[PDB]
């Protein structure tokens, strides 16, 4: 590159269609200063290990210029090509017999360089569907060359596979790699004992056009199959470590093919490998996920049995339109309120839908609108199982399902059916002598606790591959929150028994914000403002105590601690575009929110167990950080604390009024609140606490009879 | 078994001693088809009762499918200790049963995991299913291929049998919504005449699944089931027939004698017809005077099935 620009440009299309420089002896086909200069230039371009340089040092001009020409040609081809077989053509130069017999490391070095360039090129291509297909095809191709008959070919293939899986972690839980690798493992296992003296060592991999050659002696075949039998377990455990649900569903789906069932009475090593790898990589379930010092397999068996049974049942009926029958059965089951018929109809409907050629939007719409008429946990579990089966079964259906689920979620938010329900007041014990005796009335939100987990799992799965589901998640998260911190308008319940899902959703929103996906710098500002506004809402009510049992409380504390850490990790500001104004505007509120959350966490953990109870314990780092923050903020002087009251009043009068309830060992807060409420008494109309900040102008002094208009406050306790 | 978890101290000890003696003098009770279900049920009951709001009254519980009751202590520690103590005899008896006769106990375990009631609660703990699917693993043995070698593990048969059984049970149940034995017999005859393996297996499994869910013997169906493989003598049909016979024996009760009689009759007919090992002997030319076009060549009989 460097003379009209057309001259350099024209070489690219020439190299695009140029044939390979293939080839009879090689040498038969083919001024120390210039030789030394070209050697220096080529060694600077390559930068190989010193052994390759030593091998190069004894080469004349012909081999050096051949190497330079082929390097330039392949670099230009890979940079300016458009065919789907860009980088796999380099293995053609490895299979040449003439090159092998020559007195080679330069070829693998330039292959490493071109592979690095190609890998760097694709790192920022796009996030569409086709790039995933190309990466999947390349990964599948690399596996079949891991068992080549030569020696260095498999080593370089292993290195390339390791690099590719390193730079693209999302290929582990793909739905095509596992099937292909299990198939090739089964092919090798079958070829283990096939009458070595009989000819034709070739084999054909099913569902993929390729071929595999095997050595002659039994020992080499046994060694290669044993060597290959380890990467399978390694990749399986790596995939199971991060995202267990998707890979477990894929493994369940793989074991439901009719072809393998007939031969299952024989070895059929793939099924044995799967059913052996399922065991010793499982984890704890919901009940035993958070305890301080069991294993679960019932879900796998139950899901597999239900899936196979209902698939067979739905296939049996098709021998003798039919969607009307399913819809009528589902409607009758819902009207009669029967759980068994509900589950049977749901599974039959999804099994019928999974085996078809059209979307049939009415069936999907009725599937999504199903659980909302039978709000509970059993129907929610059945719906989650059906949704997982539907997602794992068919391909190219994610977007309409996500849209329908988002619509159903929005309708649930609107109807005030769950966490978004209205608030109910109760009589105060001071004047409850009537027949209306006090009693707790806590809202119950069981089903909403699992839907958020499903959303988190789906977001974690779809963070890398897709680029449109992120917009759906953002739209869903934006329409549930509102910036109306005040009396009785927040679109969220404020009871203590409903703090789990609220902070879980807040943590999900913060994780989405930290994902660095939204390009523009304007959506993030609004989202963060709404997050802070809805976070400040919970502290606008008098404190109370939890009403649930000993269980269903530890995980709430864990969620609160995790959210506190995630909030603490926002020193990511300073580039939201006068940036200093917004910077300080956010820093002050962050500090105040951290202090309030620390106080609330301390109070809750104090209420958990009265005694010290050394047997019970929680996360240590979070407790240490909370203690350090409390020690830091407990040393504030009389200043830089009265200013906080002004900020709280600027936020909302109710929050400022409810500030002394969270006890602070300083009398300046009371004086400042009294002064502020005296300056403007009309901003507050909540009697049980705010009345005592205005009535006593002076305790016993009995002076200053002005501005006292108490003829508008609501009645209080006798 | 139900008295092994009594509230007293010496009662459970003497019950354990009596159980040990009884199982010692009658070894055949290990592979019975009712002890395992009852013990799994009581284990599940204890696991459910582990966390049931101790301060709430009524510590009694009712064991399903058996008239009995179980009382539990007050403190959590005693309940955890007793359930942990009971969790060992299960593994001991399971491994003892698996050591001697693996096939029958494996078939019983496969049959146990195919009940509709437990599937709904399977999304929860349901400790019995977990115990079964954990005990299936580390007591398996080598298959036919790797049974005699000098210095691998096999699980495909279990999964294949379970999947085929559930799938074909569901398929046969789906059809009954809309006599019918004639259709099955005609399909089997057509498959045998056309000599197709897939239709052969499908018809065999459908027929045995239909037969296993009925109220009468229907001798013609059993007779056609026994006379099936003899018209398609090979190893694939033999494997399918063995699987179907094992499922039929493990599924229904009080049917062993007619099945044994029919199998004996089929075996006698096979012996008479000279279809296998009992075939005639074929001679071959001697190389000393085999200059004719009838060159010598081995002619060994083949008896795989």
Curated annotation (Swiss-Prot), chain A:
Outcome (variant: residue 657 to M): In SPG84; uncertain significance
Cell location: Cytoplasm; Cell membrane
Phosphotyrosine: residues carrying this PTM: 315
Tissue: Expressed ubiquitously. Highest levels in placenta and brain. Little or no expression in lung, liver, pancreas, testis or leukocytes.
Subunit composition and interactions: Component of a phosphatidylinositol 4-kinase (PI4K) complex, composed of PI4KA, EFR3 (EFR3A or EFR3B), TTC7 (TTC7A or TTC7B) and HYCC (HYCC1 or HYCC2). Interacts with TMEM150A; regulating recruitment to the plasma membrane. Interacts with TTC7A.
Role noted for this protein: Acts on phosphatidylinositol (PtdIns) in the first committed step in the production of the second messenger inositol-1,4,5,-trisphosphate.
Disease connection: Neurodevelopmental disorder with spasticity, hypomyelinating leukodystrophy, and brain abnormalities: A severe autosomal recessive disorder characterized by global developmental delay with impaired intellectual development and poor or absent speech, axial hypotonia, and peripheral spasticity and hyperreflexia. Brain imaging shows hypomyelination with decreased white matter volume, cerebral and cerebellar atrophy, and thin corpus callosum. Polymicrogyria may be observed in rare cases.
Homology family: Belongs to the PI3/PI4-kinase family. Type III PI4K subfamily.
Protein name: Phosphatidylinositol 4-kinase alpha
Organism: Homo sapiens
Upper classification of the organism: Eukaryota, Metazoa, Chordata, Craniata, Vertebrata
